[PDB]
Subunit: 113 residues, 3 copies
């Protein structure tokens, strides 16, 4: 069980923190959305929230990551919502399949609940 601080960037100017799948998983289009486990857990740095996005090279290989919001105070496991687009997709354990982007969390006076 690892915190976000254990993630790595591909390059200093890379916006994304790479996320791997902890299981070998096979996906087909008729399966629809599947939640892949990452072994990485929230919460995020103060005043930030997260967006999970696909890696372009993975998207182009037929695995669609659906954009997901990670709330600042989420303490569960970060999962990747993914679907094979057209073809059979095989995700091996340790393949980097998504990236976490950190964004400023803006305060508003919207009521909470």
């Amino acid at each position: 069980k690892q915190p976000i601080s254990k993630l790595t960037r591909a390059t200093p100017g890379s916006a994304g923190l790479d996320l791997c799948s902890t299981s070998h998983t096979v996906l087909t289009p008729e399966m629809g959305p599947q939640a892949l486990s990452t072994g990485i857990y929230g919460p995020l740095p103060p005043n930030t929230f997260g967006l999970i996005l696909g890696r372009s090279s993975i998207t182009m290989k037929g695995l669609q990551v659906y954009p997901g919001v990670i709330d600042n105070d989420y303490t569960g496991e970060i999962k990747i919502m993914a679907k094979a687009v057209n073809n059979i997709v095989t995700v091996s354990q340790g393949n980097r399949i998504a990236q976490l982007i950190l964004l400023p969390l803006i305060e508003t006076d919207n009521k909470v609940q």
Copy 2:
């Protein structure tokens, strides 16, 4: 006809403002993208713009929300662009089906028009 300030957050640390559908709508994959009405209207707080994203629990139930940009000065109704992925999806009136995230709008010297 309601402003964004009428939206609520699920929790203090929730990044998203929840959006409901004001109509009962049935969606099938062969329908392609449909724009669902929310009864909520722009514009946004100064120096901000919006992103519409799916709720994870809704995505996992087979309703794909396509990420949408809400411009700072948009004064129309916020619509959710959505598609049933694999199966028949029934949206009831009042179901929260998307979330609005607020982001900083960066100024640049790009020409306007």
Copy 3:
């Protein structure tokens, strides 16, 4: 070969910088994800990164743009990852098919590599 500074906004309050396709391209659902060329190149302004998103009017016409991350220091050509959802889609040369959003790039102590 053009820099991001050559892009235009539709309106002063438009969050997105519009991206065109430099080729006439036909897309069908069975083709899966295709990378469309824009003739626009990174890198981005300092302390920023990019997100490529669909235009709503294009999404509603059946062309799905998959959200893409443009890293701050990317110096290659910005491509649009796109898929025809349900129907045959014809992209003409010069049609604006996506938009680039600029976001703050947050520094963290995550290891780089």
